[PDB]
Ligand binder design. Structure first.
Ligand SMILES: CCCCCCCCCCCCCCCCCC(=O)OC[C@H](COP(=O)(O)O)OC(=O)CCCCCCCCCCCCCCCCC
Ligand SMILES: CCCCCCCCCCCCCCCCCC(=O)OC[C@H](COP(=O)(O)O)OC(=O)CCCCCCCCCCCCCCCCC
Ligand SMILES: CCCCCCCCCCCCCCCCCC(=O)OC[C@H](COP(=O)(O)O)OC(=O)CCCCCCCCCCCCCCCCC
Ligand SMILES: CCCCCCCCCCCC[N+](C)(C)[O-]
Lengths: 76, 51, 94, 223, 74, 102, 88, 67, 150, 90, 90, 60, 68, 51, 50
């Protein structure tokens, strides 16, 4: 049972439906045949997309914590 | 009148005396409204009277 | 509700009648103030224990107001009570 | 809560409250009357001032409550919000009329009018004359004029009562001396005998009940 | 009595949350009428690839959130 | 009598007829203060003695959140044969060249 | 136990406060202690010190009265102090 | 009589004709204090004894969210 | 913690305590009789006002302290429950009846009734008083009506 | 939407159970129980728990409440003595 | 600019006693205060004004002036009442 | 509550496709504006009620 | 606790559990991203609680001082 | 007698049959105030003198 | 003040580590004296005004 910064993370995790598994799959295939340019071309896309997903998620949760901490500071 | 009547507090201060015949209430009500200085309305459920 | 407006036909007030005693008029005040404050304190506490309220800016902005209004209310009741007993004391010691 | 300035006004009023009660209320009359009765009976320490003033304060509360309640209800009313200085000020003024009208019954017209004449802006020649109609003059003299005229008239009316209270005891005090002289016991101090007579007379007359009732009857109307 | 009932019920409830009740099963199904694998044909001037049943079904279900039902032609 | 209490309740997952049956099996139903509403919908009004009203409102609100895990949206597969054209993306070979149509 | 000294100081001041109720009336009656003689800042400082000099129980353990309605108790002690002031 | 209440309500999913029917099946409907408005639209006016007005305003405004 | 309004009520009460004692307790009688007898013997300042007031004060406590202690024992009672401002008012009023009874015993019914009228009748358009049958009002004269009559 | 309810006719108070906890200024038994626990402890469990944020948030309540209780008793005794002196002079 | 109007003529009154001079000074201050508070509240919620440096630079001043003015009126009122209380006590 | 609604809409559209630069560019702005709005509101609420408390403390 | 004396789960538990899980594999992005938001929500809760307790005690201290 | 006390206790690793044996070997067991519950499960009720 | 202007002293890491201590000691010394004098006069006020 969870707060509102979990609602904000989960909006990304349910937003990018399947990427979290698709990456592992792509790696399982590439590991078997590193010299295949079609596999290499696919993996570059998945790994880049995943890198951006994680950065945008973490910076958004940071910003909402900065808004909340400032409101709470005024309860004095 | 066959309706409940609500009288505003400020109107309830006024006083009246005499012997009255309620033969046709709507016609009596409008005439007294003009003589006494009241205003009235009817929503279909109750009659409201104000100064 | 938000999609409804609800009035009062004409606001007659039976409690505008003075008819009760000077002491019943006191007991009403005391009882009502004591209940209002206990309810407010409880509500404020719940709004903090519950994790979805204490972490959403929309809810925090409201809780800030609740806390301040509570503070002002109690401070004013205290002040006026002191001023009241102080008048009695000033006259009777004169 | 509300307008910040209305809050300041409420707190200022509640700070000045005991001086108003002490200077513009029937408490002034009852306080004096009870002490004069004690002096007429000739007691220097009985009852305590702390008892007499307590009683006087309670009796005054009945007389003054209805005005405070009416003025409170008049201001705790959401009816309007105000466009302008003249509308607001005349709305404020119309709330004090109950008190103004209490003071008017007991202050004296000539002294009130003299004080109202006193407030007007000075002039180099003697002030330009006026006569004003009753709705100001009879109905609505200013409170900063009414208040001291009230205080003074109350004090006067209190002394008057005390005078009447003294008379029967003076009669007693004389008679008892004349009888002791008729018996020749010229050297005995008559205070030793007159004091208990006075007490007997006051309890048989039940003076406390009469005073407490009639004083309230001067202001209340009871049926 | 009320207090004992309430607390006993709540703690017996909490002692079960860690238990898992779902399960997975495996079905083995022989194809009576066709080759399971993807077929490929080499011709004088052409290459042709045809996906198998497993390939097509997987490619259809991949990523699905909802349960299935009603296939038609606690 | 003056102590009567009244409330309006609006379930999401549990129809009125679903709740009446629970009351009956429980032996808690009372024909002097029945629930008033639409057996088909999930909104009703209740009035009566305090204990009764409170029990009703509590039980209903717990039932509602319990049944909330029920999943009802489901996907289906439809198979459709073409009678007049090739299903796949279609290649023709010109004299020296393949060309392809969607 | 870390907070024990802090609580031990508060037990001391609660005991002194309840002793003042019984010692101060004596200082009111006697002719060499009344405020016609001893007044200002010394007065409380001395009364409190005496009350601590005579309190009967070890000062460092919790006062026994925490469970009781305070007013009936304070009036009881003040009445006792008035009686002792008369007899002395 | 001096206690009459009234309210004005606007429904974003349920027509007046949809609601009257519910009141009838419930047996809450009361011909002395009918609702007043356009059966086709979703806005209406009502007045009556306070427990009735409050019951109506709450039932309609919850059911507007259910649908 | 407790309740912040009951705290205000406690501190307020303890400031008014000496005026209540001085105006609504047998101290009123005891302190008078002694001083009168002293004057009648014709030698003021024997006994001292200190002696007399001290004794009068002590004796008043035997009469009044049980009533206050009974009231606090009534309020420190963990089994009550309430639902509304009325239900609380009633229970708080019920707590004071122990004192109310003492004032009723030692004071005049008709002067009490007079002040009971005077709190209201400036409001009233009418002369009839029967309009409440006595059994409630005879039990429940207000304390502000009882005090000066006592 | 889910589980919604409202009480229409009367303001029956429900956020709290109305109780004799209205009618007291300090829960002196709750003080006497907490003060017991933080003083019977002499060489059992461990000292110096200046540092865990869950117990450190429980100490804040006690450290405040006992300071308030002691401050209140100081005023009540002065008031009482002052009332006795007031009557005896007058 | 658009939809704008100003009141040219103020209504007027006689001022003949210290009573009316007082009610007038009170009413004059009350309204100015209410107007200022409302104005600030609106300037905090029009999003063209909350986020523009030029408009924020103004709102800062308006808030400051409000604070100072109400603190002055409070102080001088309390000083006057204290002078009356001191003389009558003496 | 308009500026509260706009930000939750923007967030859904973004979460749908976190790498679209047009969506990122829009969200940056919406989030920044919301961030300034909240702070300004909280600070003025504080000032308005510190003035009331200072009034009461003046006569208290 | 396993104990009730007759007469859900809170952020304090959830943080201790997520820290415990993380410390087994400090370099997994799913676990890190799950822990950032629990440590943030625990920091906010534990500040807001203490600030309001402080406000209620300053109210009661002011009352006692006002009646001194 | 009015100092009797009650509790409910819920174990996560051990079980009631495991714990009775401990009390037995300790010589602590008391047939007047036995533990009440399901020997297979890990939750039980106990009432008795404080110690 | 003179240490802050000699360009050799103001730009050498060795010398700055000294200036930082010197300014921290000056600050603590003056805060100490200004506190104890206020307590000292507060005692005289307490005894005489009271
Ligand atoms: C005796 C004179 C008491 C002075 C009353 C001051 C009124 C204060 C105010 O207006 O705020 C009311 C305040 C708010 O009520 P409101 O004005 O209706 O909003 O209510 C209260 O809290 C009054 C609390 C009264 C407690 C007074 C202590 C009496 C103890 C005597 C016990 C005797 C047995
Ligand atoms: C006897 C009562 C006399 C009390 C003196 C009041 C002193 C007011 C201070 C002043 O002159 O500055 C006002 C000062 C004048 O400012 P101005 O408008 O810029 O001239 O503030 C005001 O505007 C008036 C606010 C006065 C509120 C006091 C209300 C007192 C109510 C008395 C009880 C009813
Ligand atoms: C006026 C409104 C009444 C308020 C009453 C509420 C009090 C409450 O519920 O909380 C208790 C609360 C005290 O808190 P506690 O001590 O923790 O129970 O307030 C009080 O201070 C009690 C005051 C009421 C008791 C009246 C006793 C009058 C006895 C008359 C004796 C007169 C002579 C004295 C002898 C020497
Ligand atoms: C002296 C006042 C302070 C202590 C309180 C005394 C309360 C009255 C106790 C009287 C007992 C008389 N007795 C034994 C005959 O019941």
């Amino acid at each position: 049972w969870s707060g509102y910064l979990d609602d904000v993370s989960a909006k990304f995790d349910t937003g990018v439906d399947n990427l979290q598994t698709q990456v592992t799959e792509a790696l399982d295939k590439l590991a078997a045949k590193p010299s295949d340019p079609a596999l290499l071309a696919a993996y570059q896309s998945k790994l880049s997309e995943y890198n951006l997903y994680r950065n945008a998620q973490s910076n958004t949760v940071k910003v909402f914590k900065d808004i909340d901490a400032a409101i709470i500071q005024n309860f004095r | 009148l066959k309706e409940p009547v609500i009288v505003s507090k400020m109107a309830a201060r006024k006083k009246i005396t005499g012997n009255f015949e309620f033969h046709d209430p709507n016609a009596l009500l409008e005439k007294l409204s003009l003589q006494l200085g009241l205003i009235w309305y009817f929503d279909g459920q109750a009659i409201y009277i104000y100064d | 509700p938000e999609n409804a407006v609800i009035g009062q036909a004409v606001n007659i007030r039976s409690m505008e009648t003075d008819i009760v005693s000077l002491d019943d008029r006191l007991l009403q005040a005391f009882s009502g103030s004591a209940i209002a404050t206990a309810v407010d304190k409880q509500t404020i506490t719940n709004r903090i224990e519950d994790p979805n309220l204490v972490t959403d800016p929309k809810e925090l902005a409201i809780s800030q107001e609740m806390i301040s209004d509570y503070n002002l209310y109690v401070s004013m009741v205290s002040t006026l009570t002191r001023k009241g007993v102080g008048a009695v004391e000033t006259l009777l010691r004169s | 809560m509300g307008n910040d300035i209305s809050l300041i006004a409420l707190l200022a009023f509640s700070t000045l409250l005991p001086f108003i009660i002490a200077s513009g209320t029937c408490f002034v009359k009852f306080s004096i009357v009870f002490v004069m009765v004690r002096n007429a009976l000739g007691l220097q320490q009985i009852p305590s001032n702390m008892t007499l003033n307590g009683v006087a304060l309670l009796l005054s509360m009945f007389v003054m409550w209805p005005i405070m309640h009416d003025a409170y209800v008049y201001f705790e009313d959401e009816d309007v919000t105000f466009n302008d200085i003249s509308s607001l000020s005349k709305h404020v003024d119309e709330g004090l009329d109950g008190y103004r009208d209490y003071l008017i019954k007991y202050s004296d017209r000539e002294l009130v009018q003299f004080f109202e004449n006193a407030q007007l802006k000075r002039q180099y020649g003697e002030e330009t004359e006026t006569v004003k109609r009753d709705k100001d003059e009879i109905e609505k003299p200013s409170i900063f004029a009414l208040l001291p005229a009230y205080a003074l008239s109350e004090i006067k009316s209190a002394f008057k009562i005390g005078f009447y209270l003294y008379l029967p005891f003076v009669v007693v005090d004389l008679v008892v001396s004349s009888v002791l002289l008729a018996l020749g016991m010229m050297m005995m101090s008559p205070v030793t005998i007159s004091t208990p007579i006075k007490l007997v007379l006051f309890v048989a007359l039940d003076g406390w009940t009469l005073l407490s009732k009639g004083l309230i009857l001067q202001y209340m109307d009871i049926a | 009595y009320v207090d004992m009932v309430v607390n006993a019920a709540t703690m017996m409830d909490k002692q079960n949350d860690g238990i898992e009740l779902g399960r997975q099963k495996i079905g083995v199904m022989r194809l009576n009428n066709t080759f399971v694998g993807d077929r490929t044909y080499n011709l004088r001037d052409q290459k042709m690839v045809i996906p198998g049943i497993a390939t097509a079904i997987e490619r259809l279900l991949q990523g699905e959130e909802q349960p299935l039902g009603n296939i038609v032609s606690e | 009598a003056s102590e009567m209490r009244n409330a309006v309740v609006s379930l999401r997952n549990v129809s009125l007829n679903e709740f009446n049956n629970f009351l009956k099996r429980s032996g808690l139903y009372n024909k002097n203060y029945p629930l008033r509403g639409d057996n088909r919908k999930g909104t009703f009004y209740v009035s009566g003695p305090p204990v009764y009203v409170d029990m009703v409102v509590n039980a209903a609100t717990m039932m509602d959140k319990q049944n909330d895990g029920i999943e009802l949206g489901r996907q289906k597969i439809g198979v459709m044969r073409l009678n007049n054209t090739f299903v796949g993306d279609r290649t023709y070979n010109l004299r020296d060249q393949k060309m392809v149509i969607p | 136990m870390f907070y024990a000294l802090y609580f031990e100081i508060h037990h001391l001041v609660a005991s002194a406060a309840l002793g003042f109720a019984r010692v101060a009336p004596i200082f009111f009656f006697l002719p060499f202690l009344n405020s016609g003689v001893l007044s200002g800042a010394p007065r409380n400082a001395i009364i409190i010190l005496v009350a601590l000099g005579v309190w009967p129980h070890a000062l460092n353990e919790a006062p026994p009265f925490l469970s009781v309605a305070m007013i009936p108790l304070v009036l009881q002690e003040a009445a006792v102090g008035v009686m002792l002031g008369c007899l002395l």
